[PDB]
Amino acid sequence: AVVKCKPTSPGRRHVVKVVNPELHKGKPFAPLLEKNSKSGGRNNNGRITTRHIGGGHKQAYRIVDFKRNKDGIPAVVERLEYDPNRSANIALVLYKDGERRYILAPKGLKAGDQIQSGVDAAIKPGNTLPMRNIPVGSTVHNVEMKPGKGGQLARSAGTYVQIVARDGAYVTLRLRSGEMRKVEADCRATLGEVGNAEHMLRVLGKAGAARWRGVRPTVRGTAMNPVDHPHGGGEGRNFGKHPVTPWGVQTKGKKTRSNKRTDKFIVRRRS
Amino acid sequence: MKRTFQPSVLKRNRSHGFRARMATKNGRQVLARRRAKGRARLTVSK
RNA sequence: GCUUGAGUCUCGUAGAGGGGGGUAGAAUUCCAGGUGUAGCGGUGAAAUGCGUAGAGAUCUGGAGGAAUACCGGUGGCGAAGGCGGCCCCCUGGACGAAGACUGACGCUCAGGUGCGAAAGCGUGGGGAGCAAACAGGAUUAGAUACCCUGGUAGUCCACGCC
RNA sequence: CGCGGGGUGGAGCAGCCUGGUAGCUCGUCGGGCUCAUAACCCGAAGAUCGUCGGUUCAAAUCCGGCCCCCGCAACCA
RNA sequence: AGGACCGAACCGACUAAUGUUGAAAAAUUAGCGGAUGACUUGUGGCUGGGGGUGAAAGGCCAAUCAAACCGGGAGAUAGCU
RNA sequence: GCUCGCCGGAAGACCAAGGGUUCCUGUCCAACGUUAAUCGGGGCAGGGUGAGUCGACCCCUAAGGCGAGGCCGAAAGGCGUAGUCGAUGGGAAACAGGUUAAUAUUCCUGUACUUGGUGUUACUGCGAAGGGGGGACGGAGAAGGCUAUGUUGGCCGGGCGACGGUUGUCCCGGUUUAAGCGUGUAGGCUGGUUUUCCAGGCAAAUCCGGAAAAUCAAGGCUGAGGCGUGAUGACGAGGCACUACGGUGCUGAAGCAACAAAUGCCCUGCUUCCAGGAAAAGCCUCUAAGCAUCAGGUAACAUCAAAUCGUACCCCAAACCGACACAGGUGGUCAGGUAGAGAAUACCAAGGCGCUUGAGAGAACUCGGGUGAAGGAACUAGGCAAAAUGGUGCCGUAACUUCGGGAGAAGGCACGCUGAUAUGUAGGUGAGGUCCCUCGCGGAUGGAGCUGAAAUCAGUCGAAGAUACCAGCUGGCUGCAACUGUUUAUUAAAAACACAGCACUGUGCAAACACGAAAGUGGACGUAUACGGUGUGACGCCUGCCCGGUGCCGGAAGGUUAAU
RNA sequence: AAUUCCUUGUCGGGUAAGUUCCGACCUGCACGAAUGGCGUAAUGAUGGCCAGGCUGUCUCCACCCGAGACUCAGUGAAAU
RNA sequence: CUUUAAUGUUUGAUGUUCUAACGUUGACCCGUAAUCCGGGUUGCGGACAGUGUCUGGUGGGUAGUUUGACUGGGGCGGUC
Missing domain, CATH: 4.10.950.10 (Ribosomal protein L2, domain 3)
Structure with missing residues (x-):
C-alpha cells in the first residue's frame, strides 16, 4: 500500500509511492493492445487547444471491455494488470469459452475469483447486470447512460455511484460529485466500488x-x-x-x- | 556560431519543389508569374 | 516427598466485557408538494432573527446524520479508562457444583512493556443536532461575559499520534 | 512653497453649501439615593464662535489679511 | 535507489583580459555551472502574422519582431527639414 | 635528401549530410593565392567513378501528408472514409588476398552464399486482403563467460656495434590469416508426447485459446566463443635481379605458448524498478470461397536470371554552412604503447603536419607570461584579477537538522629507490600427470608455468619523494528563494519563471474549455481519486476583522422593461 | 527590513577609527497573513559583512622571456 | 351597466398525455474487406432541443478613434 520514501536527495524527501505487490509484474496480454499516439493537446489544425499537456512517457492503449455483452457465462479472473492509461487497475478475465478481456477491477477482487454477467448473475462484486434487477441502495460502478453504450460514470479509481430510488424505466443515481441524476433502468451497472x-x-x-x-x-x-x-x-x-x-x-x-x-x-x- | 542555412536537398524539394508548387492554386500562380517574367529557373530543382 | 496455596480438566450460570458486520423505531434538521393566513420565534423585558417572495401551525412523501427513550436499578461487567436499541459472527475474564489431576509451579516488582476519558494534532471521509472561535442583539458605569438569534473548527467514522 | 480642509461651552462633535437669537454627548456645579463613595434619579449653570479688518441694516455663516492644526502636490533630464 | 556526489566527451555561458575599421555582424584564452536526466542530439514531420510558440523576457518566428518578409493599394499622407 | 619541432579520443583513418570533378597526369603563370611562386583546391588539355551480395530503388509501416465517394463551405476551398504515399525504423545473400598515375567487399585469384524463374524426377491436397503465432521493442543495475587487442616468453632471421663496456639473463625485427561449411559449448529460456471435448478467435479451421484425461518425465528452442576445415593456400622479415634508373621483376624463414583485457559479443539475456515502455510486411501455420484427372504444393537435381541509379574527391574542413584559402559551426564509426582510476593529462607509434609574407633590430608602450627584498588588502565601489589550496590510505571532525545530512567539515600524518619477510608474497590463472564418467567443447584430483598487488621491517639519496602536466581555498554571521531546473540568441542568470504541495472554482460526458464563420478535431478512446481555469508556492507553526464599493452566485414578490 | 522620509534614529557588538554588517528597542513617514505571515535543515557561477591562509592588488615598482611596435624587402586597405 | 352561470367560439397561458416532424457523438444490419458517410430495421428522446430572421441585455475578447491651447522650457496650478 502506501510507502513513504526515505529522504536521500531533495525531491525524494516528500515522495510517497503506492506499491501494490499483488499486481502482476510481467508484460500485458498482447492480443488486446493497440498503440496510442500523443496528441500533445493539438487538434487537426495543429494549433494547441489545451495548454498544460504534452510530452510524457510512451504508453499503449489496453482495450478494456465495457459493454460486458457476454451474458450467462462464468468468468474466472486471472491477474491484476497495471494500466498506464487510467488510474484503476484492470483485471484480465478469462471466460469459459476461452476469450480473455480486460475489465476495471472492483475493490474486493482477487485472482481466481468467479464472476459473471447477465440479468441473473449474482450479487458478488464485479458482476454486471441491468440496474432494474439491482437492489435499492446498493453501490455500483461503470454505469451506462444508455444500454450498450459501454460505461460512463464511476470509472476512476475508488469512485462509485449509489442507487437511490426507482420509478418507471428511470432510476435515480447519487453520483460521486453528489449530483442526483436519473437514468434508464435497462442500463447495465457493475456491483462494487472500483x-x-x-x-x-x-x-x-x-x-x-x-x-x-x-x-x-x-x-x-x-x-x-x-x-x-x-x-x-x-x-x-x-x-x-x-x-x-x-x-x-x-x-x-x-x-x-x-x-x-x-x-x-x-x-x-x-x- | 551556427548559421541559418543548413542545406538538405530532401527538405528543399518537399517545400519549394515543383510538385509542392503544383499543390495549391497559390503555388501554381507562382509558376504562372515566373513564366510570365521569363525567368530561367522556373522553380528550384537542380 | 505432601496437598492445605496456585493452576488444569469435567457440566453449567449471569453479564451496557471487547472487536467486526447488519438492522429497527421515535425525534430534530432540510428539500419537494397540499391545505391555510399574519404573525412566528425568543425574553425578566426586549431586540437581533424569520415571515405577505405566504412564515410558523398542519398533512403526505423523500433524504440524510447522530444518539439510542420507557425497561434502568444505594443493578451488572471490565484491571483501570470505561461499557447502555435489536441481531449475527469472532472472542476474554469471573462465579458455582461435584469430583479427578499436577505437586509450592508462589507473592511483590526498580528498569521494561502494554492499555489509558475529554480536549488536541495528522491523512482521508462524513456532517443531522449541538457548539468553542466569531458576528449581531441586548444587559451594564463598561460587559471583551452570564441572557437571546445565528454560527466555524470540533463533536461522528477508519487508521496514526498524543 | 501650490492647493485643499478646518479652528466653536471644560473635552470631542454638530450648526454652517440656502447671512437673521449656537445644539448633542460627556464633563462641571448643586440637591437626592447610600453607613460612605461609585453607579443611578432631579435641576441648573457655563461658549455669546482662532484672530485682525471688510461687506451688509445684521455676520458663527460671505470676503480678504494674519496665527495655528490637518492632508495632497512638491516632478523630467 | 536517486530530477544523489566528484568529473571527461557533451551541453551550458558565470567572471576577467584580449578583441571592438575583429581571426569573428557576440568570438578567443584562462578559470566557471550541469553532466542517468524537467538531460542532450541526428533525421523526418506539425503549428503562421493580430497569427504561431513561449518553465513568460513582450522572448523567438531565416543576422530584423510592442506585431515577420515579399508584391500590390502607393507617387499614401507630412501645417515639417 | 638529412636534421629539427607539433598533434596523436586528433591537427589521424573511414563515412553520412552538403557540395559537384576540387581526384590523377601533362602543360601555363595573364589574373586568382593576402608576398614571391617553376607550385596549386588557379588557367588549359587529356584521363579517371566497374557490384546478384555495399548503399539506393524495391517489400512494409510510424508521426504526418494527399485523399475516389462522402459531410461541410459566398467561390477559391476545409475536414476526412476506402485507399495511397511517407525512414530517421522492420525486410534475402561475401569474404580474404593481390592490383591501378587515380577505382574497388565493384577489377583479377581463391573459396562461398541468397532469392527467384524454368525444366526433369520422386511424393503430395493446394488455395485469402480472412484466423492465429511470430516479427515486437522501457529504463536501470550486476555479474560470469568470451574476443578484438596488447604484453611477455618461446621460435625464426638479422646484429655484436662511431667514445668506456657489450656472443649474452644481451640488442633489433617478424611471428598474420577471413567469410562460409562442420561441431553444437559456456550459458539462458521452456515441462513434454498422445487422445477427447468446446457458448471463443465476425464464416470455417486438423491451427490458436480454453476444459478434461491418459502418459513420460525429459524433450525442444536459443547461443557468443572455442575446436576442426576453409588454409600441403595466401601473406610474410628479408634476400635474389635489374633499374623509363623514380622502382619493377624473381625467391621466401619462422609463423607457437602463456598472461592481461574491453565501453565490443553472449545480452532485444538475467535480476529489478516503476514513469510500464512502435506499427506493419517479410516468415510459420489454419482452413473458406474456389479446384481435384488437374492446377498447385514438398523435397532433390539441373539450368538460366538477378535489372536500373549511386560508387571519383573533400567530409570537424582551404572543397559543407559563415560575402574570403576566415582562430566560428556540423551528426556517425575505429580508437595502439608507458604512467594513470580514466575517452582527463604528459611523452610517443600508426599516420599526417610546421598553419602562403619574410629578414634584422632587441626603444617607449601594448598583449601573453616568469620571478621579487621587506610589508601583506594599507589597493579598490568591491580581494576584481592573481596567488595559494589540489592526489590516495589512515586518523579525527562542531553548531544546526527535515535525523539522510551538515562533511572531502575543520585539522593532521604517511608516500621516493634498493633489499628482506617472499632467490617476487597474498591472491588470480590454470598446464602435465592421474582418476571417474549413461565419454565429450566432460567432470574431479592435481599443482607446472605465468601474472601479481598491498603491508611490515632494514638500509640509502636529495633542500624538497602526491616532486612535472594533472589536481577543492577554508571558516563565521546574515538577506532572499525551499531544492535539481528554465530565461531576455547578440550587454541583465536573478530575489524573476517553473516546481511538488496547497486552496478556490468550473465541468454528469454529444462535459466544461480551446481551434475552426461549418463539418469536425483536441479535451480523451479519459469519466468527479478525472479533466479546465485562477491564485499561492516544499516542510513546520499558521492564516485574524469587514459583504459597505466592485464582481460572481442564489431569489423571484413588486417596480421599470425590446421586438411583436 | 529587498519597505525607514526625518536618518549616519538610539543602545550594544565587531574595528585605532565602521554612513555598511550583526543583535536589540517600536515613533511601522507608508509591515502584515495565500497579490500569504513567521521560522527553516540542505541547496546557490545569488546580495551584504568579518576572520585565517595567500599573494606585485598596493606601498614602489624592478628585472626577464616571448608576440607586436621600430628599420629593410614584397603586397597594400579604411573611416574622413 | 352592475355582480357573474354554463354551452358554443375567437384565440392566450399553464400543466399532463401521444407521436408523425426533428435530434440521436444508442444498438443491429447493408453498400463494405470501411468505429467515415449513406440507407434500413429498431430503441431512446421529442414538438422541447437546435438552426434562420428580428429583438433587449452583456461584451476591452476584438477594432477604430478622441484625450485643447495659452504657458518667461513642459507637466502641476491658474486662465480662456
Whole structure:
C-alpha cells in the first residue's frame, strides 16, 4: 500500500509511492493492445487547444471491455494488470469459452475469483447486470447512460455511484460529485466500488513526476504581459482585476452549464 | 556560431519543389508569374 | 516427598466485557408538494432573527446524520479508562457444583512493556443536532461575559499520534 | 512653497453649501439615593464662535489679511 | 535507489583580459555551472502574422519582431527639414 | 635528401549530410593565392567513378501528408472514409588476398552464399486482403563467460656495434590469416508426447485459446566463443635481379605458448524498478470461397536470371554552412604503447603536419607570461584579477537538522629507490600427470608455468619523494528563494519563471474549455481519486476583522422593461 | 527590513577609527497573513559583512622571456 | 351597466398525455474487406432541443478613434 520514501536527495524527501505487490509484474496480454499516439493537446489544425499537456512517457492503449455483452457465462479472473492509461487497475478475465478481456477491477477482487454477467448473475462484486434487477441502495460502478453504450460514470479509481430510488424505466443515481441524476433502468451497472482507492494518497514528489505523467509546466497570468493574458503588467506584481480565464471568460464562480436538452435527467445539482 | 542555412536537398524539394508548387492554386500562380517574367529557373530543382 | 496455596480438566450460570458486520423505531434538521393566513420565534423585558417572495401551525412523501427513550436499578461487567436499541459472527475474564489431576509451579516488582476519558494534532471521509472561535442583539458605569438569534473548527467514522 | 480642509461651552462633535437669537454627548456645579463613595434619579449653570479688518441694516455663516492644526502636490533630464 | 556526489566527451555561458575599421555582424584564452536526466542530439514531420510558440523576457518566428518578409493599394499622407 | 619541432579520443583513418570533378597526369603563370611562386583546391588539355551480395530503388509501416465517394463551405476551398504515399525504423545473400598515375567487399585469384524463374524426377491436397503465432521493442543495475587487442616468453632471421663496456639473463625485427561449411559449448529460456471435448478467435479451421484425461518425465528452442576445415593456400622479415634508373621483376624463414583485457559479443539475456515502455510486411501455420484427372504444393537435381541509379574527391574542413584559402559551426564509426582510476593529462607509434609574407633590430608602450627584498588588502565601489589550496590510505571532525545530512567539515600524518619477510608474497590463472564418467567443447584430483598487488621491517639519496602536466581555498554571521531546473540568441542568470504541495472554482460526458464563420478535431478512446481555469508556492507553526464599493452566485414578490 | 522620509534614529557588538554588517528597542513617514505571515535543515557561477591562509592588488615598482611596435624587402586597405 | 352561470367560439397561458416532424457523438444490419458517410430495421428522446430572421441585455475578447491651447522650457496650478 502506501510507502513513504526515505529522504536521500531533495525531491525524494516528500515522495510517497503506492506499491501494490499483488499486481502482476510481467508484460500485458498482447492480443488486446493497440498503440496510442500523443496528441500533445493539438487538434487537426495543429494549433494547441489545451495548454498544460504534452510530452510524457510512451504508453499503449489496453482495450478494456465495457459493454460486458457476454451474458450467462462464468468468468474466472486471472491477474491484476497495471494500466498506464487510467488510474484503476484492470483485471484480465478469462471466460469459459476461452476469450480473455480486460475489465476495471472492483475493490474486493482477487485472482481466481468467479464472476459473471447477465440479468441473473449474482450479487458478488464485479458482476454486471441491468440496474432494474439491482437492489435499492446498493453501490455500483461503470454505469451506462444508455444500454450498450459501454460505461460512463464511476470509472476512476475508488469512485462509485449509489442507487437511490426507482420509478418507471428511470432510476435515480447519487453520483460521486453528489449530483442526483436519473437514468434508464435497462442500463447495465457493475456491483462494487472500483479498486485502487489509495491512488489519491500518491503525492508524486519531485517536479519531474508531473513531466512524465504527461503534464507540462503552467505559467500564471500575473507573470505574463498584458498582451499574453487579461492579467499582467504592473511594476510590482500588481493585480487589481477580477480573475478571468485567458480568453476572457469569467472564472471563480461562473456557471458554464449550457446543454439545456439534458436538464430533464438532472435532479439535484452539486453544492 | 551556427548559421541559418543548413542545406538538405530532401527538405528543399518537399517545400519549394515543383510538385509542392503544383499543390495549391497559390503555388501554381507562382509558376504562372515566373513564366510570365521569363525567368530561367522556373522553380528550384537542380 | 505432601496437598492445605496456585493452576488444569469435567457440566453449567449471569453479564451496557471487547472487536467486526447488519438492522429497527421515535425525534430534530432540510428539500419537494397540499391545505391555510399574519404573525412566528425568543425574553425578566426586549431586540437581533424569520415571515405577505405566504412564515410558523398542519398533512403526505423523500433524504440524510447522530444518539439510542420507557425497561434502568444505594443493578451488572471490565484491571483501570470505561461499557447502555435489536441481531449475527469472532472472542476474554469471573462465579458455582461435584469430583479427578499436577505437586509450592508462589507473592511483590526498580528498569521494561502494554492499555489509558475529554480536549488536541495528522491523512482521508462524513456532517443531522449541538457548539468553542466569531458576528449581531441586548444587559451594564463598561460587559471583551452570564441572557437571546445565528454560527466555524470540533463533536461522528477508519487508521496514526498524543 | 501650490492647493485643499478646518479652528466653536471644560473635552470631542454638530450648526454652517440656502447671512437673521449656537445644539448633542460627556464633563462641571448643586440637591437626592447610600453607613460612605461609585453607579443611578432631579435641576441648573457655563461658549455669546482662532484672530485682525471688510461687506451688509445684521455676520458663527460671505470676503480678504494674519496665527495655528490637518492632508495632497512638491516632478523630467 | 536517486530530477544523489566528484568529473571527461557533451551541453551550458558565470567572471576577467584580449578583441571592438575583429581571426569573428557576440568570438578567443584562462578559470566557471550541469553532466542517468524537467538531460542532450541526428533525421523526418506539425503549428503562421493580430497569427504561431513561449518553465513568460513582450522572448523567438531565416543576422530584423510592442506585431515577420515579399508584391500590390502607393507617387499614401507630412501645417515639417 | 638529412636534421629539427607539433598533434596523436586528433591537427589521424573511414563515412553520412552538403557540395559537384576540387581526384590523377601533362602543360601555363595573364589574373586568382593576402608576398614571391617553376607550385596549386588557379588557367588549359587529356584521363579517371566497374557490384546478384555495399548503399539506393524495391517489400512494409510510424508521426504526418494527399485523399475516389462522402459531410461541410459566398467561390477559391476545409475536414476526412476506402485507399495511397511517407525512414530517421522492420525486410534475402561475401569474404580474404593481390592490383591501378587515380577505382574497388565493384577489377583479377581463391573459396562461398541468397532469392527467384524454368525444366526433369520422386511424393503430395493446394488455395485469402480472412484466423492465429511470430516479427515486437522501457529504463536501470550486476555479474560470469568470451574476443578484438596488447604484453611477455618461446621460435625464426638479422646484429655484436662511431667514445668506456657489450656472443649474452644481451640488442633489433617478424611471428598474420577471413567469410562460409562442420561441431553444437559456456550459458539462458521452456515441462513434454498422445487422445477427447468446446457458448471463443465476425464464416470455417486438423491451427490458436480454453476444459478434461491418459502418459513420460525429459524433450525442444536459443547461443557468443572455442575446436576442426576453409588454409600441403595466401601473406610474410628479408634476400635474389635489374633499374623509363623514380622502382619493377624473381625467391621466401619462422609463423607457437602463456598472461592481461574491453565501453565490443553472449545480452532485444538475467535480476529489478516503476514513469510500464512502435506499427506493419517479410516468415510459420489454419482452413473458406474456389479446384481435384488437374492446377498447385514438398523435397532433390539441373539450368538460366538477378535489372536500373549511386560508387571519383573533400567530409570537424582551404572543397559543407559563415560575402574570403576566415582562430566560428556540423551528426556517425575505429580508437595502439608507458604512467594513470580514466575517452582527463604528459611523452610517443600508426599516420599526417610546421598553419602562403619574410629578414634584422632587441626603444617607449601594448598583449601573453616568469620571478621579487621587506610589508601583506594599507589597493579598490568591491580581494576584481592573481596567488595559494589540489592526489590516495589512515586518523579525527562542531553548531544546526527535515535525523539522510551538515562533511572531502575543520585539522593532521604517511608516500621516493634498493633489499628482506617472499632467490617476487597474498591472491588470480590454470598446464602435465592421474582418476571417474549413461565419454565429450566432460567432470574431479592435481599443482607446472605465468601474472601479481598491498603491508611490515632494514638500509640509502636529495633542500624538497602526491616532486612535472594533472589536481577543492577554508571558516563565521546574515538577506532572499525551499531544492535539481528554465530565461531576455547578440550587454541583465536573478530575489524573476517553473516546481511538488496547497486552496478556490468550473465541468454528469454529444462535459466544461480551446481551434475552426461549418463539418469536425483536441479535451480523451479519459469519466468527479478525472479533466479546465485562477491564485499561492516544499516542510513546520499558521492564516485574524469587514459583504459597505466592485464582481460572481442564489431569489423571484413588486417596480421599470425590446421586438411583436 | 529587498519597505525607514526625518536618518549616519538610539543602545550594544565587531574595528585605532565602521554612513555598511550583526543583535536589540517600536515613533511601522507608508509591515502584515495565500497579490500569504513567521521560522527553516540542505541547496546557490545569488546580495551584504568579518576572520585565517595567500599573494606585485598596493606601498614602489624592478628585472626577464616571448608576440607586436621600430628599420629593410614584397603586397597594400579604411573611416574622413 | 352592475355582480357573474354554463354551452358554443375567437384565440392566450399553464400543466399532463401521444407521436408523425426533428435530434440521436444508442444498438443491429447493408453498400463494405470501411468505429467515415449513406440507407434500413429498431430503441431512446421529442414538438422541447437546435438552426434562420428580428429583438433587449452583456461584451476591452476584438477594432477604430478622441484625450485643447495659452504657458518667461513642459507637466502641476491658474486662465480662456
